[PDB]
Amino acid sequence: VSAYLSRPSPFDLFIRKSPTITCLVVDLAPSKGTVQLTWSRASGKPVQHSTRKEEKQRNGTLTVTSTLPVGTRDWIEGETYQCRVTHPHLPRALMRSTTKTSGPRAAPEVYAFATPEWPGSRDKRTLACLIQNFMPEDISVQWLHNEVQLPDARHSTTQPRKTKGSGFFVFSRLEVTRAEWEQKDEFICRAVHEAASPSQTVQRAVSVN
Amino acid sequence: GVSAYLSRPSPFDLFIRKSPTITCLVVDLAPSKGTVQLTWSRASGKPVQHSTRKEEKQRNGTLTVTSTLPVGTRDWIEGETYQCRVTHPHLPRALMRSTTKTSGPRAAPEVYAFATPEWPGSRDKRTLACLIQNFMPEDISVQWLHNEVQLPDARHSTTQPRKTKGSGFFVFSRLEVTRAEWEQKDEFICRAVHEAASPSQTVQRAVSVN
Ligand SMILES: *[C@@H]1O[C@H](CO)[C@@H](O[C@@H]2O[C@H](CO)[C@@H](O[C@@H]3O[C@H](CO[C@H]4O[C@H](CO[C@H]5O[C@H](CO)[C@@H](O)[C@H](O)[C@@H]5O)[C@@H](O)[C@H](O)[C@@H]4O)[C@@H](O)[C@H](O[C@H]4O[C@H](CO)[C@@H](O)[C@H](O)[C@@H]4O)[C@@H]3O)[C@H](O)[C@H]2NC(C)=O)[C@H](O)[C@H]1NC(C)=O
Ligand SMILES: *[C@@H]1O[C@H](CO)[C@@H](O[C@@H]2O[C@H](CO)[C@@H](O[C@@H]3O[C@H](CO[C@H]4O[C@H](CO)[C@@H](O)[C@H](O)[C@@H]4O)[C@@H](O)[C@H](O[C@H]4O[C@H](CO)[C@@H](O)[C@H](O)[C@@H]4O)[C@@H]3O)[C@H](O)[C@H]2NC(C)=O)[C@H](O)[C@H]1NC(C)=O
C-alpha cells in the first residue's frame, strides 16, 4: 500500500487558473475498502470539496484517487496541503503532503526539430522538442498545429532530469502525418513554466522541410 | 515483501566489449535477519562462472541483495537460459527468475542527431540531442564519439525507453558540448547499440554545430 501526492500542473495553475492536486494511493491488498482520503491545510484553513475516484486495475488491485481544487493564490503564496490515508487493515496512520517547490527560478530554453525521411516511411515524420535549463522541474509541454492544441495522447514527454548544471530538461516526441504538414507545415512546441515569460509560456516553431 | 528481478546484458557489453553480465536483484522490505541465498544455473546444465554479490542496507530499513554473473558471449547469443534461484530459511517458497535472448519481434533503431542553435547569452555552449526510435526489444546502449573516441558515460544522459505509437520504443540522449570541442572538430557521433541492428548491432549518426 503506497500513497503519492502531486503538485498542480503549470498549465492548470497559470493558463487555466484552476489548479488541483491529486492524492493517489496504490493498494496491494484490496478487501472491504472503506479507505478514506482526508484533506487538510497546514494553516488550518478550509479545503474545498474534493473528488474521490476509484478504478479497479487489471492486476487484481484497487487504485483510489482524490482530487482537490486549490486556490491559485493560495498555492503560489506557499500553502501546504495534506492528504491522510486511513485503512482498516493497516495500523491506521499514513500521511502525504505537498507545497510549491522552493529555490531559484530559471526560464526554459525551447528547441524544436524535425526528423528527415526514413526509408519506407514517406508519409510521416517525428518532431522532437528539447526544453532545458529551467527550475524548478515542474513544467507543462504542449503541441500546436494551426494554433489548435493537439490532443495530449499524440505526444509523450520525458520526466524531468537534471542537466550538468542546476536546471532540468525534458524531451517531447510528436509523430505527425503528411496530411498535416501539407495542410500547414508548421508545428509549435510550447512549454508552460512559472519562470517562463511572457505569460509563463515559451514556444518554438518547427517545419518539416 | 520479497521481490526479485533478473536483467539481461547491456548491448554494449554483449556486442562491443564482449563481456556480458546478467544481474539478479533481490529486494526485501522486512529483513528477517538471515541469509537470502542466490544460486545461479544454466538450462543446459553447463557450469556458471563465479558471480559477485553485494548486500546493501537501505535508508528505509531494507535489505537489497544483488549478484552479477559473467556470461559467455557466444552462449548468450546462441540462446542459453540463465536462472537465479532465491531462497531464505523462513519464506513461502523459492523464487525462480530466468533470462534469455528474445525470440519475439525485433526491430532496428532509427537514429537522428540534432544540434541546438545558439541561445542568447550562451554562444560558447551547444546541446547535442539524439533521437533513437522504433526499436525492439527495449535493451539499448548509447555512446557519443568525438575524434573517433568514445566520450565518458557521465558526459551524456539518456532517457528511459518509452513506448512509441505503433511499435517499439524510443530514447533521447542529451550531450552538452563546448566551443573548444566543436572548433577543434565539428563532428559528434551518436551511436546506438542494439541486437536487431544490422550487420554489426550498431546504428550511428553524426551531427555538427555548424
Ligand atoms: C497493478 O497495476 C496498476 C496499474 O498499472 C499499478 O498502478 C501503478 O503503480 C505504480 C507503482 O507505484 C504507480 O507509479 C507511481 O505513480 C506516482 C504518481 O505520479 C505518476 O502518476 C501521475 C498520475 O497522473 C497520470 O494519470 C492520470 C490518469 O490515470 C492523468 O489524469 C494524468 O494526467 C497523468 O497522466 C502523473 O501525474 C505523474 O506524472 C506520474 O506519472 C509517482 O509519484 C510514483 O513515482 C515515485 O517514484 C519515482 C521514482 O521511481 C519518483 O520520481 C517519484 O517522485 C515518486 O517518489 C510512481 O511512478 C502508478 O501511478 C500506478 N498507476 C495507477 C493508474 O494506479 C500497480 O502498481 C500494479 N500493482 C503491482 C503490484 O504491480
Ligand atoms: C526501500 O528502499 C529501496 C531502495 O531505494 C527500494 O528498493 C527498490 O525497489 C524497487 C522496486 O522493487 C526497485 O525498482 C526495480 O528495479 C529493477 C531493477 O532495475 C534495473 O534496471 C534498470 C534499467 O535501467 C537500472 O536503471 C537499475 O539500476 C537496475 O539495474 C527494475 O527491473 C524494476 O522494473 C521492473 O519492475 C517494474 C514493477 O516493479 C515494472 O514496472 C518494470 O517495467 C520492470 O519490469 C524496478 O524498477 C529498485 O531497484 C530498488 N532499489 C534498489 C537500490 O535496489 C525499496 O522498494 C524500498 N521499499 C519500499 C517498501 O518502498
Side-chain angles (χ1 to χ4, degrees), chain A, chain B residues 1-28 30-210:
Chain A
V1 181
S2 50
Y4 317 97
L5 178 60
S6 57
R7 299 176 289 268
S9 77
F11 177 62
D12 287 353
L13 177 68
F14 298 116
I15 310 304
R16 283 195 176 186
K17 301 187 170 175
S18 63
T20 58
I21 57 179
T22 304
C23 189
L24 170 66
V25 39
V26 186
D27 297 326
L28 301 179
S31 59
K32 262 288 179 185
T34 62
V35 178
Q36 190 174 9
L37 296 185
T38 306
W39 285 106
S40 59
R41 296 211 227 166
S43 70
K45 293 178 171 164
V47 292
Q48 296 181 46
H49 181 75
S50 66
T51 292
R52 191 166 191 269
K53 178 180 166 202
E54 58 192 22
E55 284 283 342
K56 190 170 64 172
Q57 307 299 139
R58 64 167 182 79
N59 54 355
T61 290
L62 187 66
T63 291
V64 34
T65 73
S66 189
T67 299
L68 185 68
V70 305
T72 297
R73 207 59 213 158
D74 289 339
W75 183 269
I76 293 293
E77 287 166 352
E79 176 67 283
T80 84
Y81 300 77
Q82 311 159 156
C83 176
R84 191 159 197 169
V85 187
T86 315
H87 198 281
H89 284 305
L90 299 175
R92 46 195 296 185
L94 202 177
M95 302 207 53
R96 296 285 103 85
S97 64
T98 191
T99 180
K100 73 152 179 189
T101 300
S102 48
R105 318 278 94 166
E109 314 171 10
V110 183
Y111 312 92
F113 309 93
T115 64
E117 184 180 301
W118 194 262
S121 296
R122 277 184 180 181
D123 308 357
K124 58 192 192 190
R125 300 283 132 79
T126 307
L127 305 174
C129 196
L130 169 54
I131 320 290
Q132 65 175 28
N133 294 345
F134 60 90
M135 51 192 302
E137 66 189 310
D138 285 5
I139 201 182
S140 294
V141 177
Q142 60 208 204
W143 293 86
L144 301 100
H145 188 226
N146 298 303
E147 279 186 2
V148 302
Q149 198 180 123
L150 300 164
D152 287 341
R154 281 267 252 109
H155 77 263
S156 61
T157 308
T158 60
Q159 291 291 129
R161 284 163 160 269
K162 264 189 169 163
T163 65
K164 282 164 61 180
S166 285
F168 298 81
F169 73 88
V170 294
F171 284 98
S172 198
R173 188 168 168 281
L174 181 71
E175 306 176 43
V176 306
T177 61
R178 173 158 269 156
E180 291 171 348
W181 81 63
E182 290 196 340
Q183 182 267 318
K184 171 70 165 173
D185 191 14
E186 171 167 303
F187 307 77
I188 287 169
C189 176
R190 175 146 69 194
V192 181
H193 191 272
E194 67 172 331
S197 45
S199 318
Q200 287 84 32
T201 60
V202 186
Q203 63 179 31
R204 210 82 177 275
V206 66
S207 297
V208 174
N209 310 321
Chain B
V2 183
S3 291
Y5 306 93
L6 186 55
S7 86
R8 294 184 291 272
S10 82
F12 173 71
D13 285 342
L14 185 55
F15 303 113
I16 284 51
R17 288 198 63 211
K18 293 188 187 170
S19 60
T21 60
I22 61 180
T23 300
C24 189
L25 171 62
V26 179
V27 181
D28 193 359
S32 171
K33 290 303 96 194
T35 299
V36 296
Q37 306 171 23
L38 290 184
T39 307
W40 289 105
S41 63
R42 288 211 253 172
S44 63
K46 295 172 189 178
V48 282
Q49 291 168 53
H50 291 122
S51 60
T52 304
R53 172 164 171 154
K54 195 182 181 192
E55 302 169 35
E56 285 194 339
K57 284 186 174 184
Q58 308 295 313
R59 265 47 178 167
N60 51 354
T62 168
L63 183 57
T64 275
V65 172
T66 65
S67 181
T68 307
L69 179 64
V71 156
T73 309
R74 202 200 199 195
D75 301 341
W76 183 267
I77 301 305
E78 294 179 348
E80 177 68 271
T81 313
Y82 300 80
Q83 180 181 313
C84 176
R85 180 184 178 83
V86 181
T87 287
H88 193 267
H90 191 76
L91 64 45
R93 64 179 296 286
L95 296 175
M96 294 185 286
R97 299 294 180 273
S98 63
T99 189
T100 186
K101 200 170 181 75
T102 66
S103 53
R106 298 159 169 82
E110 309 175 9
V111 177
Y112 312 99
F114 300 104
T116 64
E118 187 181 314
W119 195 259
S122 55
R123 56 174 269 109
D124 295 337
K125 307 184 196 187
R126 296 296 194 280
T127 312
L128 303 190
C130 187
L131 171 57
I132 312 165
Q133 71 174 27
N134 299 336
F135 58 89
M136 59 180 310
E138 59 267 40
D139 306 19
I140 195 156
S141 299
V142 180
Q143 303 87 33
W144 289 87
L145 314 149
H146 189 232
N147 305 323
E148 300 80 50
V149 149
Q150 184 180 157
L151 295 182
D153 298 0
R155 270 277 228 143
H156 73 262
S157 183
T158 311
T159 64
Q160 313 182 32
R162 279 177 153 262
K163 280 162 182 175
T164 73
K165 316 297 162 166
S167 56
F169 295 85
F170 73 90
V171 293
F172 282 102
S173 192
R174 193 180 164 273
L175 180 66
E176 294 172 45
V177 294
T178 58
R179 188 165 204 107
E181 291 185 83
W182 80 68
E183 286 196 335
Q184 179 268 308
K185 184 148 187 180
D186 199 9
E187 190 175 21
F188 306 81
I189 297 173
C190 174
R191 182 166 71 193
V193 189
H194 188 272
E195 66 193 286
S198 63
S200 295
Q201 302 74 51
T202 59
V203 191
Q204 72 188 60
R205 210 93 323 155
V207 65
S208 298
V209 167
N210 282 325

